[PDB]
């Protein structure tokens, strides 16, 4: 009944691939915010 | 038959990733000066 | 007979997502080569 | 039944992408100096 996915590793790997770009790109633009994150910011 | 939905959210986010790089390569392409253009349009 | 893929857009979008990283990363490391590519190099 | 193969090449390339960023974030993490360490090992 359940045909299941024919490539669960590729898709499961795409979700992180996309989120990755959103991060790598968000850093290139907000490179300043990232620098602050490491510097303190945790409280 | 209760299941009937693929993954449109992951898709919109996927093509978006392709667009993210389009800006990446487009940015590295246009540096600052150096830009020839032939005057020819509505002006 | 052919179940076809359940998400041809996601996978078809992953192949470019991966190649993208290989390029974006290859540039961060060979940023010099990329600069040369645009500067002449075509002959 | 003649068809019997998924996409292992795209997978190895996919996980590799995840590893590419692992180096990206790991690089931004370690800047240059500033590195405390507790002497405690085989020495």
Swiss-Prot record, chains A, B, C, D:
The chain crosses the membrane at residues 6-26. It is found in: Virion membrane; Host apical cell membrane. A lipid is attached at residue 33 (S-palmitoyl cysteine). The record marks 20 as: Essential for channel activity, possibly by being protonated during channel activation, and by forming the channel gate and the selective filter. Coiled coil: none annotated. Glycans are attached at residue 3. Forms a proton-selective ion channel that is necessary for the efficient release of the viral genome during virus entry. After attaching to the cell surface, the virion enters the cell by endocytosis. Acidification of the endosome triggers M2 ion channel activity. Belongs to the influenza viruses matrix protein M2 family. Strain A/Udorn/307/72 is a laboratory-adapted strain. When the channel is activated, one or more imidazole moieties of His-20 probably become bi-protonated. Homotetramer; composed of two disulfide-linked dimers held together by non-covalent interactions. May interact with matrix protein 1. This is Matrix protein 2. It comes from Influenza A virus (strain A/Udorn/307/1972 H3N2).
């Amino acid at each position: 009944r359940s045909n299941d996915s024919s490539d669960p590793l590729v898709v499961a790997a795409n979700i992180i691939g996309i989120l990755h770009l959103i991060l790598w790109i968000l850093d290139r633009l907000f490179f300043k915010s990232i620098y602050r994150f490491f510097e303190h910011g945790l409280k």
